[PDB]
Design a protein around this ligand. Structure first.
Ligand code: NAP
Ligand code: NAP
Ligand code: CL
Ligand code: CL
Lengths: 354, 351
């Protein structure tokens, strides 16, 4: 056991010196000894970022490989052996892993309480994760997955979650993927608030509907925005009092309908969980004066949000949605255990085994 | 005077119907009658977005013009007459205007109090502003400016500022340019807070230093981050208690130095006012747990900030720096009037 490990993991950065593990080019993936504030994982499965997986697959096709599973497996071993991690060298994307705890340093900053042998999922990207792949058992070309024998390091600053014994693994992973959204909504929504959820039928959207309605309470108002009439029942069953039919890019219709439904008062909190571009101004205009607009979509443009609010004189607070929050996995999993409607929808949509 | 004008201005959108004035292709710039919630301006000068001005200049050269001032003037007349606004048709960029209030609709949402004749600057883009150019008097090729006779519409949702007749106009416009930064900093900093200002020697930075120190007070702590030791006296004179020398992209140095100056407690509030990319993670790591990180720079990447905080388990709030806030002009100008050190620096730097 090595001493004086950096919680941010800089002790494993080989190239270039003086940067963090994520932007680094080469990490130390020597698993024979760990630092005192690290956690070592026996990796079972690698869930590669879909864009990275597709980009690597197509690069290999273009180079002329016929056996794609074998070419991909060999690509992953070469990449991880040389750079210490599975960070896509063209996109910068990573992924996450599933495995069982192998060793815990005595100064590891424990978050969720876990012990050797526990089954866990990482909630930080493979783009900063020291990873040693000893064997690729299977490349699942259609699932962006590799079943492997290997090991990974979590730094004390990293994030992980114990996978619950009583839940379908893919169901649990689906909640963990978006756990930050309901966690943040719980912090934002006051009793009696009006809340507008843009993209309310989505995976994070239906979780946001439910905690928004729990937090806003009996005299609050939760308004979902969807573009498909097919989604109205689900939005209402998961917490929406009202549903607006609009493209999330249609600022005028959303403003008009939110105004109708609130008698001009508009929303205290706007939660944006769409996966498309140019929805910043429609979200801003749904808010009341000094309201809160929480942008979760990775499609959000900083400049479009900033210039959007300036051009129409909207004095609103606009937050970059932080996917991490203390206890967010436990909070999101507890939401599904309290709400049988959500649990049934999540199992139907995202459970592997039915 | 027509009634039931939309505060967002959709009643002047001709093409395509169903979008807002800024994304619209064609606006109605008929100034003979205004709507009840509009304000009509006699425009003196058009400050064209510099990139837009340069793109139009070069387009005209390539078409074969030679007398650029005259071709540019004719370009602006054709563009505004046809589309109703000076929105650059290739880039989408606009600009702002300076003018005198001509008429005030009876239902205009008054922000700062102005009456007919007041000298004002628009603080919203020419790309959403109905604009009629009756004459171009002078095209200033080195200044991205046109002196004109014409009129413009401010919607009730628009933003403007009265230009005080007692201050140099370039100085006033420079303050208006960054007024949202001190205004927003005033709301975030509590007494006894530790505040880190990244880019503390810049135009917005020195205003943020001063506001951070008055709000954090005698037992608060204001830390500037700059990369030049020559900037230290200015940072301290405008409010910093301590100054860190680091590149704003150097997350490890900034984290270590903020930790040193705060005994590991880190910053309650981080203000990022640099004009450089890849400073998100350094800003996040300067904050304490559940601290507030305010990104003012237009170089801020949404995904870099979100994924940055996620990867190191930083439960911090990250705010998109708005740039507009109620009364921001008045608040920033009052800061200069109350703080002789800032006024003197702003005078020397920004004419
Ligand atoms: N940082 C984090 O950890 C974090 C946390 C939560 C969310 N997020 C982000 O939030 C976004 C949503 O993620 P998710 O997993 O919830 O995705 P999802 O399940 O695909 O949900 C997206 C929803 O938005 C709707 N939508 C997209 N574009 C639309 C438009 N133009 N008009 C109307 N509706 C539209 C979709 O419905 P249609 O069927 O109509 O397309 C869908 O219901 C992603 O960008 C994700 O990265 C990130
Ligand atoms: N409209 C809005 O929403 C709004 C409002 C307020 C601020 N802002 C934004 O804030 C940014 C700054 O505005 P400004 O007018 O204050 O600009 P400015 O006067 O040029 O200030 C930028 C400051 O940052 C420093 N800096 C830049 N890169 C650095 C690096 N890598 N390391 C250390 N220091 C660095 C510069 O110092 P050096 O001399 O060392 O380069 C300079 O002092 C702009 O992007 C602006 O758009 C926008
Ligand atoms: Cl006219
Ligand atoms: Cl962005």
């Amino acid at each position: 056991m090595k001493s004086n490990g950096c919680r941010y993991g800089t002790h494993r950065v080989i190239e270039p010196k003086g940067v963090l593990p994520q932007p680094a080019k080469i990490l130390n993936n020597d698993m024979s000894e760990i630092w005192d504030n690290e956690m070592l994982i026996d990796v079972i499965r690698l869930n590669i970022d879909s864009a990275s997986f597709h980009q690597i697959k197509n690069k290999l096709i273009a180079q002329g490989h016929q056996d794609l599973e074998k070419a991909f497996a060999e690509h992953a071993i070469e990449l991880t052996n040389r750079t210490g991690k599975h960070k896509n060298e063209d996109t910068g994307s990573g992924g996450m892993f599933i495995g069982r705890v192998a060793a815990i340093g005595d100064k590891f900053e424990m978050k969720e309480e876990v012990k050797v042998g526990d089954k866990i999922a990482s909630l930080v990207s493979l783009s900063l994760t020291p990873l040693k792949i000893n064997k690729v058992k299977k490349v699942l070309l259609d699932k962006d997955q590799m079943e492997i024998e290997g090991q990974a390091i979590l730094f004390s600053s990293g994030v992980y979650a114990k996978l619950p014994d009583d839940l379908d693994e893919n169901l649990a992973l689906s909640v963990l993927d978006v756990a930050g959204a309901p966690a943040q909504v719980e912090r934002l929504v006051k009793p009696d608030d009006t809340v507008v959820i843009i993209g309310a039928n989505g995976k994070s959207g239906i979780l946001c509907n439910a905690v928004a309605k729990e937090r806003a309470g009996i005299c609050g108002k939760v308004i979902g925005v969807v573009r498909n009439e097919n989604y109205i029942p689900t939005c209402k069953a998961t917490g929406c009092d009202e549903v607006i039919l609009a493209q999330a890019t249609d600022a005028i219709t959303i403003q008009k309908e939110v105004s109708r439904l609130t008698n001009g008062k508009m929303a205290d909190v706007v939660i944006n969980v769409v996966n498309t571009e140019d929805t910043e101004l429609p979200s801003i205009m749904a808010a009341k004066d000094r309201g809160m607009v929480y942008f979760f979509s990775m499609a959000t443009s900083f400049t479009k949000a900033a210039l959007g609010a300036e051009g129409i004189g909207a004095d609103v607070d606009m937050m970059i949605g932080n996917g991490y929050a203390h206890h967010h996995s436990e909070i999101a999993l507890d939401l599904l255990r309290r709400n049988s409607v959500l649990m049934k929808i999540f199992k139907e949509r995202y459970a592997e085994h039915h």
